[PDB]
Structure 1
Amino acid sequence: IVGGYTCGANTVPYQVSLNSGYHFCGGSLINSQWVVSAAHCYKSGIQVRLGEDNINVVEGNEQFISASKSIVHPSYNSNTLNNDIMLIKLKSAASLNSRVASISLPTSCASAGTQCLISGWGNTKSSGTSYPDVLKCLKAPILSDSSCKSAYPGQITSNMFCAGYLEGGKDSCQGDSGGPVVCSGKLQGIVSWGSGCAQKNKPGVYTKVCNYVSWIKQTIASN
């Protein structure tokens, strides 16, 4: 997260860190046994890390649970990042409390102008690299489909939305992908892609979660 703020320990209780020997992606807990992430976060040997603040120190609220199954969206295209969504089943159910909690799925799609919360352990610099240890947050609005399409000609599908600031300076970044975009307590987006970070007219691009609720519910109900 570039130009964000320190969330505060366990203040984003649904935020998970996907670890394969190191943090490589964010995720969102949607029930005690399932995490929602980006399909580009797919890999073998994922350990889901819940209740994290500092991802480099055991602070006492973590739950480390290996993934038993990963389900990439059947229509994910890694070249266009269309349908950039994946489900991860936990080997054991997470113990839910105030610090480790599921995030509700949307009942409807959030509009442009809706204020959301984006969070993650991604790079905090727009030029250069600095990975934070603690969870970073960014309050950002959803951008109109027209401004999103104008920023990224020929790249925005009906399964994507932009959020952030066209003036730049505040964006998600390397390491935040897979993580949440939560608006009014609903998971509306997954950190997906961009062109650099916090650059003018290049806001972050997010997977449009409301388009996947039926697939998520059906998948959970059968796996």
Structure 2
Amino acid sequence: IVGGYTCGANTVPYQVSLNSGYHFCGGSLINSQWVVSAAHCYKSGIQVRLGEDNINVVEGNEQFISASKSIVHPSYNSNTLNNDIMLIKLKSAASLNSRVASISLPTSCASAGTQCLISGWGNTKSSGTSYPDVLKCLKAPILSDSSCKSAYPGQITSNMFCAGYLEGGKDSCQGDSGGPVVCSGKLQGIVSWGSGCAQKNKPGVYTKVCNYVSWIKQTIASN
């Protein structure tokens, strides 16, 4: 997260860290046994780490659970990043409490202007690389479809939305991928892509979760 702030230990209880010997992607806990992330985060040998703040020190409250199966959306396209969504089933159900809790799926899509909270352990620099120990947060509004498509001509599908600041300086970045975009207590987006990080007129692009609620529910029910 570039231009964000330190969230505070366990203040984003649904935030998950995907680990394979190091943090590589974020995710959101949607129930005791399922996590939603980005399809481009797919990898074998994924350990889901819940209740994390400092990802390098064991501070208490952490729950490490192996992924039993990762389900990449069947229509995911790796070049366009359309349908960039993946469901991860935990080997065992997580112990939900004050510091580890699930986030609700939306019943309707969010409108332009809606303020949302984006979080992650991704790169904190626009020019260069600097990864944080603790979780970073950023409040950003959903932009209009017009501005989104003007920024990324011919690259925005109906399953994507832009969020952020056109003036640059505040944005999600590499490492934040798969993480949550929560608006009014509902998971509306998943960190997907963008051109660089926190660049002028190049806001972040996110997977539009409201378009996948039926798919998520049907898939979870059959697995």
Q: CA deviation at 1:103?
A: 0.3
Output the CA distance in 2 between the equivalents of 1:149 and 1:99: 38
Output the CA distance in 1 between the equivalents of 2:159 and 2:19: 26
Q: Summarize deviations over 1:35-91 as a string: whole Å, max 9, x none.
A: 000000000000000000000010101100000000000110010000000000000
Q: CA deviation at 1:32?
A: 0.3
- The normalised TM-score by structure 2 is 1.00
Output the CA distance in 2 between the equivalents of 1:39 and 1:179: 11
Output the CA distance in 2 between the equivalents of 1:13 and 1:115: 19
Output the CA distance in 2 between the equivalents of 1:112 and 1:64: 37
Output the CA distance in 1 between the equivalents of 2:196 and 2:203: 9
Output the CA distance in 2 between the equivalents of 1:160 and 1:51: 28
* Runs of at least 5 residues in structure 1 that lack an aligned partner in the other structure: none
Identical residues among aligned pairs (%): 100
Output the CA distance in 2 between the equivalents of 1:151 and 1:157: 13
State the aligned residue count. Answer: 223
Output the CA distance in 2 between the equivalents of 1:211 and 1:56: 35
Q: CA deviation at 1:201?
A: 0.5
| Secondary structure of the corresponding residue to residue 218 of structure 2 | helix
Q: What aligned pairs does 1:68-79 form with structure 2 within 5 A after superposition?
A: 68-79=68-79
Output the CA distance in 1 between the equivalents of 2:188 and 2:138: 15
Output the CA distance in 1 between the equivalents of 2:222 and 2:102: 19
Q: CA deviation at 1:178?
A: 0.2
In structure 2, what is the equivalent of residue 19 of structure 1?
19
Output the CA distance in 1 between the equivalents of 2:46 and 2:86: 13
Output the CA distance in 2 between the equivalents of 1:106 and 1:120: 21
Output the CA distance in 2 between the equivalents of 1:57 and 1:159: 37
Output the CA distance in 2 between the equivalents of 1:220 and 1:20: 24
| Secondary structure of the corresponding residue to residue 212 of structure 1 | helix
In structure 2, what is the equivalent of residue 66 of structure 1?
66
Q: CA deviation at 1:189?
A: 0.1
Output the CA distance in 2 between the equivalents of 1:93 and 1:69: 13
Q: CA deviation at 1:7?
A: 0.3
In structure 2, what is the equivalent of residue 44 of structure 1?
44
Q: CA deviation at 1:193?
A: 0.3
Q: CA deviation at 1:200?
A: 0.2
Q: CA deviation at 1:164?
A: 0.3
Output the CA distance in 2 between the equivalents of 1:82 and 1:70: 18
How big is the alpha-carbon RMSD for the aligned residues of Structure 1 and Structure 2? Answer: 0.4
| Secondary structure of the corresponding residue to residue 89 of structure 1 | strand
Output the CA distance in 2 between the equivalents of 1:143 and 1:9: 29
In structure 2, what is the equivalent of residue 83 of structure 1?
83
In structure 1, what is the equivalent of residue 57 of structure 2?
57
Q: Summarize deviations over 1:152-196 as a string: whole Å, max 9, x none.
A: 001000000000000010000010000000000000000000000
Q: Summarize deviations over 1:136-164 as a string: whole Å, max 9, x none.
A: 00000000011000000010000000000
Output the CA distance in 1 between the equivalents of 2:80 and 2:100: 33
* Runs of at least 5 residues in structure 2 that lack an aligned partner in the other structure: none
Q: CA deviation at 1:211?
A: 0.3
Q: CA deviation at 1:33?
A: 0.2
Output the CA distance in 2 between the equivalents of 1:58 and 1:222: 35
Output the CA distance in 2 between the equivalents of 1:168 and 1:217: 36
Q: Summarize deviations over 1:115-141 as a string: whole Å, max 9, x none.
A: 000000000000011000100000000
| Secondary structure of the corresponding residue to residue 149 of structure 1 | helix
In structure 2, what is the equivalent of residue 105 of structure 1?
105
- The normalised TM-score by structure 1 is 1.00
Q: CA deviation at 1:214?
A: 0.3
